[PDB]
Each structure stands twice: as structure tokens, then as C-alpha cells.
Amino acid sequence: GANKTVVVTTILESPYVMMKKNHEMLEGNERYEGYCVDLAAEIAKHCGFKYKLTIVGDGKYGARDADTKIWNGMVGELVYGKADIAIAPLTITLVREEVIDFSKPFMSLGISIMIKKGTPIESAEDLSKQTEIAYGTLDSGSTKEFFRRSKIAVFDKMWTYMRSAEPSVFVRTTAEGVARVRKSKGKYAYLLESTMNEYIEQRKPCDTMKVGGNLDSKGYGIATPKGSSLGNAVNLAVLKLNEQGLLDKLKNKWWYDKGECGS
Amino acid sequence: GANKTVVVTTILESPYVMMKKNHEMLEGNERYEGYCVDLAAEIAKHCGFKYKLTIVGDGKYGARDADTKIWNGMVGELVYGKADIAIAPLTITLVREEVIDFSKPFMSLGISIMIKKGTPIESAEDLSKQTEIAYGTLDSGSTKEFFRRSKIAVFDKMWTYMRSAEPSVFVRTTAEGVARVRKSKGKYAYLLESTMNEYIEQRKPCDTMKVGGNLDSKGYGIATPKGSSLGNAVNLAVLKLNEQGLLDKLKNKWWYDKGECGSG
Ligand SMILES: CCn1nnc(O)c1C[C@H](N)C(=O)O
Ligand SMILES: CCn1nnc(O)c1C[C@H](N)C(=O)O
Ligand SMILES: [Cl-]
Ligand SMILES: [Cl-]
Ligand SMILES: [Cl-]
Ligand SMILES: [Li+]
Ligand SMILES: [Li+]
Ligand SMILES: [Li+]
């Protein structure tokens, strides 16, 4: 049929999508800026579609409820037909690949540790062998699932602690995790993906640090409902944008050119 | 060949695929060892297929010949129906994605610079601003195409130099490029992917090193002919092996540092 506006699900997560300064008097896509706003414009230009950015209603990346088997977050929006594409820092995982389609990755990353500067932790093993410093992950996504599924002793030990810790060590948004690190006087460390950790390290008051090696190696993909005809063109666009240097330019723009912690 | 046997095309490139010691008295898949040999076994077990390892006849990764329009290398063996899958350090690129299918990546890497130790080069920008030290890439693959297509000033300047350099700076195999670095007394530098550069730096004769940051960020994928029924299961197997930690285990095994250079 005739062209329809493509509904893009995404998540309010700096620097991927952020409210523009004057958003209160703006409408539609003009309300937003960021890495994924720019990426959406490039993908749409290369693929020849018009689109509307829509923030995921529940604020989540996406996980499947073990009891009901219902998917939430951006994954759920695609699975249940509420959006046509997700353009967000959404990790390619096996359980998600089984239910939605993904482009080849537009960014490479791994789980990492965020500390308040001066915290005496250098590794996941360090966290797992002490109890003074609490630690947790984001809810409803790939990082929490990594710990729940790991057979590696250090990560099983960490999961066994986190799942039963009181008060809860899990957070609903990345921003809540950052605040918990910043306000906890060294007594909370946050487990999150490396490029988000790197972003926060460039933001005032410049009081957090990424420590240790990444725990894994994976990627973000542009996601579509399984079998959607949009997937092929979107994937070719991702590969072209990578090869032309545009994805590197966008990371540099939003992470480093705009950094607040010096040169 | 035998029914139900998946023909795997791969390439001799250490430590991905190597001839075992005394391979002359071995047969079939047992002749070979390395990261991609182990990966092929893991993929085949997860997907439930028997397979035959074959070394690509022309020794190339794969590009589309500018004149004849014919794909060569492992890509060509898939395109023309000679192999059923490629399991190799084969880079996922746009031009290849248009003609073959790829899994999600099993390894992440980028183009990098190999110098003979002591060469006064620290970056791609350094190479681009001088002419005493020649530099080049492998023929018939993703690294050459990267420079040919790039509009980034430094990389465009490097391409303009490399494409007309005499004698030619392009090499037929990674081994030829490394040998040329070693024998050129600092006057040749080689552009090759990072994981290989790192493997070579930690081994005798301990005379090369990786310098500068990676020039790009990309991945190796398992390739199948476009539309092949094998692709879906192979992709899920790559993701499962990554999530189980097995790809990291394989990397750590085949890049294990026994201390050939320094302390280990
Ligand atoms: C900024 C994204 N992010 N940073 N840390 C975590 O855990 C996430 C979410 C993850 N990419 C997902 O798809 O669940
Ligand atoms: C070990 C592989 N490699 N190291 N440097 C280059 O250029 C290559 C080949 C490349 N992965 C291709 O698919 O063409
Ligand atoms: Cl460089
Ligand atoms: Cl430029
Ligand atoms: Cl290991
Ligand atoms: Li999928
Ligand atoms: Li066969
Ligand atoms: Li393809």
C-alpha cells in the first residue's frame, strides 16, 4: 500500500535520545536530540522512509516475564506490533534474536563496572569477594540476564548476592544507577555497558570511573519485527554508515566533542 | 562428496586455521587446527551437521574482480555454489552482505598498523604525511576496499598513495605482508586487522608491533550462500556460543602467550 510513517520505538537515555532545550514548545521529532536521533535520520534517508520517534511507554529495554511469557519494553513494542522499528542502544542477545530481527551491530560494547572515584575495586572478582560495597544492574534487560544465566563462578556468586540483596540493588533507569553511585560515598558500584560508562565519565561532576576489563563482548542492533520487509534495507544502511565513518563521527560528537570533563 | 555433508570453505591464516605438525600423515578435517577449526566443530555440533573442511583454492578472502565482475576467494566459493558455509576471519562488509548471508559477528576487531620495531610511525596520520616508509594492504579483501572507498581525509590520502605506489604495496597473503615488514628494515609498514597484528607481536622473532588505535570497528561473521537454510541455525549458534563464554575461551586458547617475547 501507500507509504506510511514508520513508528520508531526508542528510549530516553542520554546521549542516545534526550529532550532538546526548548522541547516544551516543540512537537514531533523536533523534541529530541542525540546519537540515536541522528542515526534514525540517517537510516531513514538511506532507506527512503518517513518516521515518528516514540518513547517506549514503560521505559524499558525488554525482557520476557518468566511466568506470563509476555515481553516488555522496546522488544515488546515490536513483538506486539506497536512499533515498526527500534533505534536505541538495544543489545543483540539470543533470547531477543529468537523473537525479533536485528541488523548487524552499529556499536560494540561489553558489561563494565562503574565506581565512584577512589572506590577500592578493580574487577568483578573484587566485587564478588567483599560485602561492604553493594552493586547491581538495570532491570528488564540484557545485563541482568547475563548474571542470571552465567555458569562462571564469579558471576554466579555476584548474581546470588544481587538477587537477594536488601534494599534492592537493581535500578529502573541508567540515570538512577548513576545517582546511586554518585551519592553512595563509594559503597555502591553499578554494572552497565561500557560505552554508557564511558559517556558518564565525560559528564560533570566527573566523579565516576570505568574500572576493569569488559565482562563480555557484544553489540547493539537496529531491531524490527520478525520477518519485517524493512530489515534488509536497514541492515545495509548500518553497514554503509559504519564503512563511511559516520557511526564513529556520531560517537565522537556525543561523547567527546560535547564532553564536560576537559579535553 | 557425501550426502548431508556441509562443505566448509576456510583459509590458512594463523591461528585461525593451521596445518598440524605431521599433517602429511593425517587425513580430512584432522589435518587442521586453530580457532576456526574449533569454531567449526562447535557450530556443527549445535546445528547437527557433518562437515568437510576445505581450504579456499585461490587463497583469498574475496572481492569482486573489477574487470570480469566475478567474485574470488571464499566469497566466490559461496556465490558460485562450491561451498555451503565459510568459517574464517572473514569481515562483514556491505558489498559482501549484498551477495552472501552472514551471522552476527563472532569476533570484533579493526584495521591496524604493523611496523618493524623502532620505525618512526605512531598513527595513520603519520603514515599519510611522509613518503620514506611505504605501506600497503592485503589484496582482494575488506582492508583494501576500506581505503578505496573512504572519504576520511587521512585514509583518502593513504589510498591515493597506495593505489599508485611502485613497486606495488599490495600483498597476496598476510604472511607476505608480515615478511615484507620484517625484511624492509623499517621501510614497509603493513595495514592488517588488529587480532592478527597482536598475535604476531607476541611471537618470535619479536620484531614487529601494533601502533596507534584501530582505524575502524567491525566484525567477522560466518557466511552462507544467500538464502541458505543453514543461516538461521548458524546465527543462533554464534549467539549461544558467545553468551556461554566459549568464544572468549577460544580466543584465550589460540592467543595464549607462552612468553616467546620477554617475560610472558
Ligand atoms: C545504555 C544501555 N545499557 N547500558 N547498560 C545496560 O544494561 C543497558 C541496556 C541494554 N543495552 C539492553 O538492551 O538491555
Ligand atoms: C586475518 C584477516 N585479515 N587481516 N587483515 C585483513 O585485511 C584480513 C582479511 C579480511 N578479514 C577480509 O575479510 O578481507
Ligand atoms: Cl592511527
Ligand atoms: Cl575527515
Ligand atoms: Cl580462558
Ligand atoms: Li531475530
Ligand atoms: Li555436501
Ligand atoms: Li548478505
Coordinates of all heavy atoms in Angstrom, one line a residue, chain B residues 180-237:
Chain B
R180 N 57.4 -8.9 4.5 CA 57.9 -7.6 3.9 C 58.2 -6.6 5.0 O 59.2 -5.9 4.9 CB 56.9 -7.1 2.9 CG 57.4 -6.0 2.0 CD 56.4 -5.8 0.9 NE 56.7 -4.6 0.1 CZ 56.0 -4.3 -1.0 NH1 55.0 -5.1 -1.4 NH2 56.3 -3.1 -1.6
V181 N 57.4 -6.5 6.0 CA 57.7 -5.7 7.2 C 59.1 -6.1 7.7 O 60.0 -5.2 8.0 CB 56.7 -5.7 8.3 CG1 57.2 -5.0 9.5 CG2 55.4 -5.1 7.8
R182 N 59.2 -7.4 8.0 CA 60.5 -7.8 8.6 C 61.7 -7.6 7.8 O 62.8 -7.3 8.4 CB 60.3 -9.3 9.0 CG 59.3 -9.5 10.1 CD 59.2 -10.9 10.5 NE 58.5 -11.0 11.8 CZ 57.6 -11.8 12.2 NH1 57.2 -12.8 11.4 NH2 57.1 -11.7 13.4
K183 N 61.6 -7.7 6.5 CA 62.8 -7.7 5.6 C 63.1 -6.3 5.1 O 64.1 -6.1 4.4 CB 62.6 -8.6 4.4 CG 62.5 -10.1 4.8 CD 62.1 -11.0 3.7 CE 62.0 -12.4 4.0 NZ 61.4 -13.2 3.0
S184 N 62.2 -5.3 5.3 CA 62.4 -4.0 4.6 C 63.1 -3.0 5.5 O 63.1 -1.8 5.2 CB 61.0 -3.5 4.2 OG 60.4 -4.4 3.2
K185 N 63.6 -3.4 6.7 CA 64.5 -2.5 7.5 C 63.7 -1.3 8.0 O 64.3 -0.2 8.1 CB 65.8 -2.2 6.8 CG 66.6 -3.4 6.3 CD 67.8 -3.0 5.6 CE 68.6 -4.1 5.1 NZ 69.0 -5.1 6.1
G186 N 62.4 -1.4 8.2 CA 61.7 -0.3 8.7 C 61.0 0.5 7.6 O 60.3 1.5 7.9
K187 N 61.2 0.2 6.3 CA 60.7 1.0 5.2 C 59.4 0.4 4.6 O 59.0 0.9 3.6 CB 61.8 1.0 4.1 CG 63.1 1.6 4.5 CD 63.1 3.0 5.1 CE 64.5 3.5 5.4 NZ 64.4 4.8 6.1
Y188 N 58.8 -0.6 5.2 CA 57.5 -1.0 4.9 C 56.7 -1.2 6.1 O 57.2 -1.8 7.1 CB 57.5 -2.3 4.0 CG 56.2 -2.8 3.5 CD1 55.6 -2.1 2.4 CD2 55.4 -3.8 4.2 CE1 54.3 -2.5 2.0 CE2 54.2 -4.2 3.7 CZ 53.6 -3.6 2.6 OH 52.4 -4.0 2.2
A189 N 55.5 -0.7 6.2 CA 54.5 -0.9 7.2 C 53.3 -1.6 6.6 O 53.0 -1.3 5.5 CB 54.1 0.4 7.9
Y190 N 52.6 -2.4 7.4 CA 51.5 -3.2 6.9 C 50.2 -2.9 7.6 O 50.2 -2.9 8.8 CB 52.0 -4.7 7.0 CG 51.0 -5.7 6.4 CD1 50.5 -5.4 5.1 CD2 50.6 -6.8 7.0 CE1 49.6 -6.3 4.5 CE2 49.6 -7.7 6.4 CZ 49.2 -7.4 5.2 OH 48.2 -8.2 4.6
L191 N 49.2 -2.8 6.8 CA 47.8 -2.5 7.4 C 47.1 -3.8 7.4 O 46.8 -4.4 6.3 CB 47.2 -1.4 6.5 CG 47.8 0.0 6.6 CD1 47.5 0.7 5.3 CD2 47.2 0.7 7.8
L192 N 46.7 -4.3 8.6 CA 46.0 -5.6 8.7 C 45.2 -5.5 10.0 O 45.4 -4.6 10.8 CB 47.0 -6.7 8.8 CG 47.7 -7.0 10.1 CD1 48.4 -8.3 10.1 CD2 48.7 -5.8 10.5
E193 N 44.3 -6.4 10.1 CA 43.4 -6.4 11.3 C 44.1 -6.7 12.6 O 45.1 -7.4 12.7 CB 42.2 -7.3 11.0 CG 41.3 -6.7 9.9 CD 40.3 -7.6 9.2 OE1 40.5 -8.9 9.4 OE2 39.4 -7.2 8.6
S194 N 43.5 -6.1 13.6 CA 44.2 -6.0 14.9 C 44.5 -7.3 15.6 O 45.6 -7.5 16.1 CB 43.3 -5.2 15.9 OG 41.9 -5.6 15.9
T195 N 43.6 -8.3 15.5 CA 43.8 -9.6 16.3 C 45.0 -10.3 15.7 O 45.8 -10.9 16.5 CB 42.6 -10.5 16.3 OG1 41.4 -9.8 15.9 CG2 42.4 -11.0 17.7
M196 N 45.2 -10.3 14.4 CA 46.4 -10.9 13.8 C 47.6 -10.1 14.2 O 48.7 -10.8 14.4 CB 46.2 -10.8 12.3 CG 47.4 -11.3 11.5 SD 47.4 -13.0 11.9 CE 46.2 -13.4 10.8
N197 N 47.6 -8.8 14.1 CA 48.7 -8.0 14.4 C 49.2 -8.3 15.9 O 50.4 -8.5 16.1 CB 48.3 -6.5 14.3 CG 49.4 -5.5 14.1 OD1 50.6 -5.9 14.3 ND2 49.1 -4.3 13.8
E198 N 48.2 -8.4 16.8 CA 48.5 -8.8 18.2 C 49.2 -10.1 18.3 O 50.1 -10.3 19.1 CB 47.3 -8.6 19.0 CG 46.7 -7.2 19.1 CD 45.2 -7.1 19.5 OE1 44.6 -8.0 19.8 OE2 44.7 -5.9 19.3
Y199 N 48.7 -11.1 17.6 CA 49.2 -12.5 17.7 C 50.7 -12.5 17.3 O 51.5 -13.1 18.0 CB 48.4 -13.4 16.7 CG 48.9 -14.8 16.7 CD1 48.5 -15.7 17.6 CD2 49.6 -15.2 15.6 CE1 48.9 -17.1 17.5 CE2 50.0 -16.5 15.4 CZ 49.7 -17.4 16.4 OH 50.1 -18.7 16.2
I200 N 51.0 -11.8 16.2 CA 52.3 -11.8 15.6 C 53.3 -11.0 16.5 O 54.4 -11.4 16.7 CB 52.3 -11.2 14.2 CG1 51.5 -12.2 13.3 CG2 53.7 -11.0 13.6 CD1 51.1 -11.6 12.0
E201 N 52.8 -9.9 17.2 CA 53.7 -9.1 18.0 C 54.2 -10.0 19.2 O 55.3 -9.7 19.7 CB 52.9 -7.9 18.6 CG 53.7 -7.1 19.6 CD 53.1 -5.7 19.9 OE1 52.1 -5.3 19.2 OE2 53.6 -5.1 20.9
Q202 N 53.4 -10.9 19.7 CA 53.8 -11.7 20.9 C 54.7 -12.9 20.6 O 55.0 -13.7 21.5 CB 52.6 -12.0 21.7 CG 51.7 -13.0 21.1 CD 50.4 -13.1 21.9 OE1 49.9 -12.1 22.5 NE2 49.7 -14.3 21.8
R203 N 55.1 -13.1 19.3 CA 55.8 -14.3 18.9 C 57.1 -13.9 18.3 O 57.3 -12.9 17.7 CB 54.9 -15.1 17.9 CG 53.7 -15.7 18.6 CD 52.7 -16.3 17.6 NE 53.3 -17.5 17.1 CZ 53.2 -18.7 17.7 NH1 52.5 -18.8 18.8 NH2 53.7 -19.8 17.1
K204 N 58.1 -14.9 18.3 CA 59.4 -14.8 17.7 C 59.2 -14.5 16.2 O 58.2 -15.1 15.6 CB 60.2 -16.1 17.9 CG 60.7 -16.1 19.3 CD 61.2 -17.5 19.7 CE 61.9 -17.5 21.0 NZ 62.2 -18.8 21.5
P205 N 60.1 -13.7 15.5 CA 61.3 -13.1 16.1 C 61.1 -11.8 16.9 O 62.1 -11.1 17.1 CB 62.1 -12.9 14.8 CG 61.1 -12.7 13.7 CD 60.0 -13.7 14.1
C206 N 59.9 -11.5 17.3 CA 59.7 -10.4 18.2 C 60.1 -9.0 17.7 O 60.6 -8.2 18.5 CB 60.4 -10.6 19.6 SG 60.0 -12.2 20.3
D207 N 60.0 -8.8 16.4 CA 60.5 -7.6 15.7 C 59.4 -6.7 15.2 O 59.7 -5.7 14.5 CB 61.5 -8.0 14.7 CG 61.0 -8.9 13.6 OD1 59.9 -9.4 13.7 OD2 61.7 -9.2 12.6
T208 N 58.1 -7.0 15.4 CA 57.0 -6.2 14.9 C 56.2 -5.7 16.1 O 56.1 -6.3 17.1 CB 56.1 -7.0 13.9 OG1 55.4 -8.0 14.6 CG2 56.9 -7.6 12.7
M209 N 55.4 -4.7 15.8 CA 54.4 -4.3 16.8 C 53.3 -3.5 16.2 O 53.4 -2.9 15.1 CB 55.1 -3.4 17.9 CG 55.4 -2.1 17.6 SD 56.2 -1.2 19.0 CE 54.9 -0.8 20.0
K210 N 52.2 -3.5 16.9 CA 51.0 -2.7 16.6 C 51.2 -1.3 17.1 O 51.5 -1.2 18.3 CB 49.8 -3.4 17.2 CG 48.5 -2.7 16.9 CD 47.3 -3.5 17.3 CE 47.1 -3.5 18.8 NZ 46.6 -2.2 19.3
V211 N 50.9 -0.3 16.3 CA 51.0 1.1 16.7 C 49.7 1.8 16.4 O 49.1 1.6 15.4 CB 52.2 1.8 16.1 CG1 53.5 1.2 16.6 CG2 52.2 1.9 14.6
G212 N 49.3 2.7 17.3 CA 48.1 3.5 17.1 C 46.8 2.8 17.4 O 46.8 1.6 17.8
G213 N 45.8 3.5 17.3 CA 44.5 3.0 17.6 C 43.9 2.3 16.3 O 44.4 2.5 15.2
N214 N 42.9 1.5 16.5 CA 42.3 0.8 15.4 C 41.7 1.9 14.5 O 41.1 2.9 15.0 CB 41.2 -0.2 15.8 CG 41.8 -1.5 16.4 OD1 43.0 -1.7 16.4 ND2 40.9 -2.3 16.9
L215 N 41.7 1.7 13.2 CA 41.2 2.7 12.3 C 39.7 2.6 12.1 O 39.0 3.6 11.6 CB 41.8 2.6 10.9 CG 43.3 3.0 10.7 CD1 44.3 2.3 11.6 CD2 43.7 2.9 9.3
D216 N 39.1 1.5 12.4 CA 37.7 1.2 12.3 C 37.3 0.2 13.3 O 38.1 -0.3 14.1 CB 37.3 0.9 10.8 CG 37.9 -0.4 10.4 OD1 38.7 -1.0 11.1 OD2 37.5 -0.8 9.2
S217 N 36.0 -0.2 13.3 CA 35.4 -1.2 14.2 C 34.5 -2.0 13.4 O 33.5 -1.5 12.9 CB 34.6 -0.5 15.4 OG 35.5 0.3 16.2
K218 N 34.7 -3.3 13.3 CA 33.9 -4.2 12.5 C 34.0 -5.6 13.1 O 34.5 -5.8 14.2 CB 34.2 -4.0 11.1 CG 35.5 -4.4 10.7 CD 35.9 -3.7 9.5 CE 37.4 -3.8 9.2 NZ 37.6 -3.1 7.9
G219 N 33.5 -6.6 12.4 CA 33.3 -7.9 12.9 C 33.5 -9.0 11.8 O 33.3 -8.7 10.6
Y220 N 33.9 -10.2 12.3 CA 33.9 -11.4 11.4 C 32.6 -12.1 11.6 O 32.1 -12.3 12.7 CB 35.0 -12.3 11.9 CG 36.4 -11.8 11.7 CD1 37.4 -12.2 12.6 CD2 36.8 -10.9 10.8 CE1 38.7 -11.8 12.5 CE2 38.1 -10.4 10.7 CZ 39.1 -10.9 11.6 OH 40.4 -10.5 11.5
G221 N 32.1 -12.6 10.5 CA 30.8 -13.4 10.6 C 31.0 -14.7 9.8 O 31.8 -14.8 8.9
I222 N 30.2 -15.7 10.2 CA 30.1 -16.9 9.4 C 29.2 -16.7 8.2 O 28.1 -16.2 8.4 CB 29.6 -18.1 10.3 CG1 30.7 -18.5 11.3 CG2 29.2 -19.3 9.4 CD1 30.2 -19.5 12.4
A223 N 29.6 -17.0 7.1 CA 28.9 -16.7 5.8 C 28.3 -17.9 5.2 O 28.9 -19.0 5.2 CB 29.8 -16.0 4.8
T224 N 27.2 -17.8 4.6 CA 26.4 -18.8 3.9 C 26.0 -18.2 2.5 O 25.8 -17.0 2.4 CB 25.3 -19.3 4.6 OG1 24.5 -18.2 5.2 CG2 25.7 -20.3 5.7
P225 N 25.6 -19.1 1.6 CA 25.0 -18.5 0.3 C 23.7 -17.8 0.7 O 23.0 -18.2 1.6 CB 24.8 -19.8 -0.5 CG 25.8 -20.8 0.0 CD 25.8 -20.5 1.5
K226 N 23.4 -16.8 -0.1 CA 22.2 -16.0 0.2 C 21.0 -16.9 0.1 O 20.8 -17.6 -0.8 CB 22.1 -14.9 -0.9 CG 21.2 -13.8 -0.5 CD 21.6 -12.5 -1.3 CE 20.7 -11.4 -0.9 NZ 21.0 -10.2 -1.8
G227 N 20.2 -16.8 1.2 CA 19.0 -17.7 1.3 C 19.2 -19.1 1.8 O 18.2 -19.8 1.9
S228 N 20.4 -19.5 2.1 CA 20.6 -20.8 2.5 C 19.9 -21.1 3.8 O 19.8 -20.3 4.7 CB 22.1 -21.1 2.8 OG 22.4 -22.2 3.6
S229 N 19.3 -22.3 3.9 CA 18.6 -22.8 5.1 C 19.4 -22.9 6.3 O 18.9 -23.0 7.4 CB 17.9 -24.1 4.8 OG 18.8 -25.2 4.5
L230 N 20.8 -23.0 6.1 CA 21.7 -23.1 7.3 C 21.8 -21.9 8.1 O 22.2 -21.9 9.3 CB 23.1 -23.5 6.8 CG 23.6 -24.9 6.8 CD1 25.1 -24.9 6.5 CD2 23.3 -25.6 8.1
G231 N 21.6 -20.7 7.5 CA 21.9 -19.4 8.1 C 21.3 -19.2 9.4 O 22.0 -18.8 10.4
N232 N 20.0 -19.5 9.6 CA 19.3 -19.2 10.8 C 19.9 -20.0 12.0 O 20.2 -19.4 13.1 CB 17.8 -19.5 10.7 CG 17.1 -19.4 12.1 OD1 17.3 -18.5 12.8 ND2 16.4 -20.5 12.4
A233 N 20.2 -21.3 11.9 CA 20.7 -22.1 13.0 C 22.1 -21.6 13.3 O 22.5 -21.6 14.4 CB 20.7 -23.5 12.7
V234 N 22.9 -21.4 12.2 CA 24.3 -20.9 12.5 C 24.3 -19.6 13.3 O 25.1 -19.5 14.2 CB 25.0 -20.7 11.1 CG1 26.3 -19.9 11.2 CG2 25.2 -22.1 10.5
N235 N 23.5 -18.7 12.9 CA 23.4 -17.4 13.6 C 23.1 -17.6 15.1 O 23.7 -17.1 16.0 CB 22.4 -16.5 13.0 CG 22.4 -15.1 13.7 OD1 23.4 -14.5 13.8 ND2 21.2 -14.8 14.2
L236 N 22.0 -18.4 15.4 CA 21.7 -18.7 16.8 C 22.8 -19.4 17.5 O 23.1 -19.1 18.7 CB 20.4 -19.5 16.9 CG 19.2 -18.8 16.3 CD1 18.0 -19.8 16.4 CD2 18.9 -17.6 17.0
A237 N 23.6 -20.3 16.8 CA 24.7 -20.9 17.5 C 25.8 -20.0 17.8 O 26.4 -20.0 18.9 CB 25.2 -22.0 16.5

